[PDB]
Design a protein around this ligand. Structure first.
Ligand SMILES: *Cc1c(COP(=O)(O)O)cnc(C)c1O
Ligand SMILES: *Cc1c(COP(=O)(O)O)cnc(C)c1O
Lengths: 434, 435
């Protein structure tokens, strides 16, 4: 009878990553409506897709116009005005030189699968450089190059070099030590001439919202590029204005050969894209096909996302409003010693929970999960990430308001204090742990 | 528009994402027709390859999409149950025969659904081997292409442990039903022990392989040979599913009782949506095993509910048998005028026309001739494609809402296009760019 109980009976566990009992019947602005009518503040952005919140007029108009006058349902078969104009848009807002082209897909997973498939074929090189903790997708091709603990049920693609992502909060490995490790692999067991590409998250997402040390990723890029290794930046998570600039890679001085877009590009509709040089992206006809990719409904939604971000200056606003939210969370740390760090850029914010500030020992996952659950009871939706399952993740809609930040901060404040005073029971969160 | 949409597409769209059969470049769509830039209204016999099951601007789909995008119940089923997606899953369980506990996973495409299927079948069964068919097309992502047998993906080696068998083809009958079963029995007795085989993947009509309907009883005998050893039986309904063949599921023509069914294309009505229906012990194998952020989002799943509801309410399975029969028969009678029409096969509104350079040998027509027929179709006001291991089978997958007057308009256009091409009235340079 309850939506949540119905879900339990028909939805497959393989597709669940559920942090709380929240079960939804609608949304409006930056709030989500639980079954029963309770209005929850969404600090999750549904993990990134909901860039403009829910029921946003620009996305609604674009999707209305397109589904009523539908310009086919397959870019592979038929050019349509929305998908071609979106590609034009993406080339216009993404700096780059030479001839470049755009491929469309449904998800970050399929866009990285495309990237891997076309890069290895255009180079006929089979080795790939990526990062421990990197999350590039959960389909066979994109999972295969990912380094995240969650996909260790399956072996990596052969010839993947996994490096530590240098972490300024837990600096086991300095930038310099990681580059030296790469250099040593290049001179030995991973000759750079047999490497197709390096894959870079400009902030390490599911690995724990780790902003790398300054200048490291520009130095990585330059080391790879000397050997004609193509430089791929995954902007799926932190892309499109969220970090204070249009592309997170613009913080890091990068000039990538290829950019992968997803999540928030769709504004809550499935939409991904790969932008690369024409010589790679025109490798062969009919090489990476999905029937409804580049369909006029999802692409029209993507055009509205980009248009709103530019016209309303949501990059600058994410810097300002994210600074406010970040600073509110830092102040909570004078109250709650479990807050060890507040990091990220703009409206991509992670809060690192520690059981001890000295050692920076991560707080146990049970505590982290209980804070989420308690936040849900108090009226906010969020999640956690990190290689130690201890980093609270805030990825709210870019439309988040200053009064909502106040509300968010008070909820987080209360949920931490409650959980630390033993408010939430083990059996309440057992359902949402693996 | 001096800068045509076609030209703009050439400047910015990746060739890897193209499978273009004509210059048709779109600004809209209405009913069963597509609107070319400049305004010309084209009859859609392609159904955009299957997704457009109810055509374009269909009011049930328009309504579901409007309500969901305006009042959006989150955008991620992996994070949050939503009413649309839970209800669609309930709908798919209800309309798909099956026994015991079952569950539903959602995705965006046939390719991601079959990737899911292969990943979870091997993991849950603890068997590594897969049975598939030569010419089968289960997708174009790494995991789904890996179990596929089609000639377009021979640029990449298959997944290790895949046994590829011929699909018995009544029109080019190199391999009988009995011969294929014998060959499988032989592999089972030697180098492919059947207790190491997770699953067999079955297209109930071989789609990109040439719209081949198997010989009667073959698929049921294949099911039984595999099931006898605990091999799970997977039917791919992505292409010919959901009423198009005259029954709700194409496998219901073939006496099949699958363990797992894969849906896509038309399920979404033009929005991206796929699904896998499987037994609970497989589908609940582990949490967070096959995740895609926006899968099961309330917009795409609402569109799917509208598709299924319209198909049941308006009786579109029953209609497609009747209307597809009329269309198929028009096409057959065209073989009296045009000897290039070697066969018309299919079920319901999944129809293939096999073009041959010789009626006796059944040698496939050259691909340049087939491309010219599509191009001339397009100029005459109809959009269609070709398929097949020899690039010679005209494909007709129109919206299930295709009208009887549109069937006459279609048959006439095809008739005129074949005639104009055979009489040497279509240039080589006009099709050069689509091959
Ligand atoms: C979420 C994510 C992906 C995968 O996107 P899906 O839409 O979940 O398949 C890929 N790369 C990064 C950096 C991500 O955060
Ligand atoms: C088209 C098709 C697929 C793949 O669907 P996409 O949405 O193009 O990835 C899978 N199986 C069959 C039988 C198909 O016809």
């Amino acid at each position: 009878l309850s939506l949540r109980e119905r879900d339990a009976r028909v939805i497959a566990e393989i597709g669940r990553l559920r942090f709380s009992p929240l079960s939804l019947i609608g949304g409006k602005g930056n709030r989500l409506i639980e079954e029963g009518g309770r209005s929850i503040l969404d600090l999750s952005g549904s993990a990134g897709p909901a860039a403009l919140g829910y029921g946003h007029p620009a996305i609604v108009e674009a999707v209305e116009k397109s589904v009523r006058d539908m310009a086919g349902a397959s870019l592979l078969l038929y050019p349509n005005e929305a998908a071609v104009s979106l590609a034009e848009d993406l080339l216009r807002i993404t700096p780059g030189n030479g001839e470049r082209r755009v491929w469309f897909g449904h998800s970050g997973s399929d866009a990285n699968d495309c990237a891997v498939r076309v890069l290895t074929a255009a180079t006929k090189r089979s080795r790939i450089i990526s990062f421990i903790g990197s999350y590039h997708g959960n389909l066979t091709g994109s999972m295969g190059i990912s380094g995240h603990t969650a996909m260790t049920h399956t072996l990596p693609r052969p010839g993947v070099l996994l490096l530590p992502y240098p972490d300024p909060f837990r600096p086991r490995f300095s930038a310099e030590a990681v580059l030296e490790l790469l250099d040593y692999h290049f001179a030995t067991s991973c000759p750079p001439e047999q490497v197709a590409a390096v894959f870079i998250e400009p902030i390490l997402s599911d690995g724990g919202l780790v902003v790398p040390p300054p200048a490291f990723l520009e130095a990585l890029q330059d080391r790879c590029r000397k050997h004609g290794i193509l430089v791929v930046v995954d902007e799926v998570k932190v892309g499109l204005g969220r970090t204070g600039l249009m592309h997170c890679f613009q913080h890091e001085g990068l000039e990538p050969d290829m950019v992968v877009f997803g999540k928030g590009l769709g504004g809550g509709l499935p939409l991904s894209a790969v932008v690369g040089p024409q010589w790679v992206m025109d490798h062969a006809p009919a090489f990476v096909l999905q029937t409804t990719a580049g369909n006029p409904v999802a692409t029209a939604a993507g055009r509205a996302v980009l248009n709103t971000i530019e016209r309303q200056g949501l990059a600058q606003r994410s810097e300002r409003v994210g600074g406010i939210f970040a600073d509110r969370l830092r102040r909570l740390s004078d109250k709650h010693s479990i807050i060890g760090d507040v990091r990220g850029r703009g409206l991509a914010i992670g809060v690192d929970l520690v059981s001890d500030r000295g050692s920076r020992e991560p707080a146990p996952v049970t505590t982290t999960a209980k804070i989420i659950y308690r936040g849900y009871q108090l009226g906010a939706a969020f999640t956690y990430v990190g290689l130690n399952a201890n980093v609270l993740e805030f990825m709210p809609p870019l439309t988040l308001t200053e009064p909502e930040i106040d509300e968010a901060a008070d909820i987080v404040d209360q949920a931490i204090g409650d959980v630390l005073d033993g408010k939430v029971a083990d059996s309440d969160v057992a359902h949402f742990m693996m």
